[PDB]
């Protein structure tokens, strides 16, 4: 768990060197993008349940997975699916605020593949659900904030696949 600042400090410390001009430029880049990160995080905190339910309405609804036999069939499985998608959106917001995806592979992508493979959860359908969540939130917060959200959404989909 480290943001862009802590990773820059960790690189300069593992070097043992002081903060040179490249580290200063990286921190200036983060300190310019931080206000946009803050406003996108507020806008995403506004519409958590709406983004999640629009992602299910785009991908998972009216398909086979909500029908009998699907892994999203029962009300318990539906509630756990909404819970999993809320987790993905919340941690993508955290990784957007930090500017570093270390929290994603520390706390989402750690044992997620083995959990989903033990439960029988389809990984492709949940990857499509995360992609539709990314599409909806990029329609919500704009072009560049949607892109800096979608880089961590693509990180979650890549670590899941």
């Amino acid at each position: 768990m480290q943001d862009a600042i802590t990773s820059v400090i960790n690189s300069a410390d593992v070097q043992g060197k002081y903060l040179d001009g490249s580290a200063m430029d990286k921190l200036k880049a983060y300190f310019t993008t931080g206000a946009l990160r803050v406003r996108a995080a507020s806008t995403i905190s506004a519409n958590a349940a709406a983004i999640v339910k629009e992602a299910v309405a785009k991908s998972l609804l009216y398909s086979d997975v909500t029908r009998p036999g699907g892994n999203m069939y029962t009300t318990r499985r539906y509630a756990a699916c909404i819970r999993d998608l809320d987790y993905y959106l919340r941690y993508a917001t955290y990784a957007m605020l930090a500017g570093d995806p270390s929290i994603l592979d520390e706390r989402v992508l750690n044992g997620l593949k083995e959990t989903y493979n033990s439960l029988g959860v389809p990984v492709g359908s949940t990857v499509q659900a995360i992609q539709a969540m990314k599409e909806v939130t990029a329609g919500l917060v704009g072009a560049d904030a949607g892109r800096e959200m979608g880089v961590y959404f693509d990180y979650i989909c890549s670590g899941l696949s």
Binding site: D64, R67, P68, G69
Partner: protein, 50 residues
Amino acid sequence: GEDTVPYERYLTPGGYSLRQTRPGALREDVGVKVKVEKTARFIELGTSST
């Protein structure tokens, strides 16, 4: 024309009305429409795959 024995070529509407519109001889389009017989859409939606 000197090769075939005759055969009943024409009926009156009385005789045809006698034989065909009897209930066992009847079809089911003959006089009013029949609607289409689909299954219920909630049964079709409740199956296990498209």
